[PDB]
């Protein structure tokens, strides 16, 4: 509850910075650097998972990988709330791996999303990802992105800037 949000915030906090070495570029899944082309996430890894509800509604949620089957090219993932029937069998294109390192803005600004980029971002106090534009990338290792969520309750179509951690901003694989 409040417990879940504490865990999720800690997961964002404890995501390690990538400390390369001078002269080295950061790995896939550092910050905004995409996964390698045929990548399969490991059991226990955190992902954004696109869940199709029984009525057809599509929502990206925060989840944890349980398994992957070469037999079918599908994952099982568990909704991070771990409530009720938490498990979902999903195609690989419905899974985006979350970053496994924070990009350090001093050393690897190239591995951050930039102003005006369209992203999926976890909405504060929720476990769901939604379309957003980057308002500001972080400038300190500890800092969040600032993003503008699409939000039709505003005449201009966007939220004010809201903070979302690096762990919880990924490439936008959702149509409007």
């Amino acid at each position: 509850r409040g417990v879940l949000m504490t865990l999720l915030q800690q997961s964002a906090m404890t995501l390690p910075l990538w400390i390369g070495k001078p002269g080295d570029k950061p790995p896939p899944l550092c910050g905004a650097i995409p996964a390698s082309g045929d990548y399969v996430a490991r059991p226990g890894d955190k992902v954004a998972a696109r869940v199709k509800a029984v009525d057809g509604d599509e929502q990206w949620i925060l989840a944890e990988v349980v398994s992957y089957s070469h037999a079918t090219n599908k994952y099982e993932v568990d909704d991070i709330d771990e409530e009720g029937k938490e498990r979902h069998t999903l195609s690989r294109r419905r899974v985006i791996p979350l970053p496994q390192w924070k990009a350090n803005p001093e050393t690897d600004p190239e591995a951050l999303f930039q102003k005006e980029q369209l992203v999926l971002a976890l909405y504060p106090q929720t476990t769901c990802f939604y379309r957003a534009l980057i308002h500001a990338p972080p400038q300190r290792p500890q800092d969040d992105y600032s993003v503008l969520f699409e939000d039709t309750s505003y005449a201009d179509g966007y939220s004010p800037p809201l903070n979302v951690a690096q762990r919880y901003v990924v490439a936008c694989k959702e149509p409007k």
Partner: peptide, 4 residues
């Protein structure tokens, strides 16, 4: 999941 917890939605907006």
């Amino acid at each position: 999941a917890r939605t907006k």
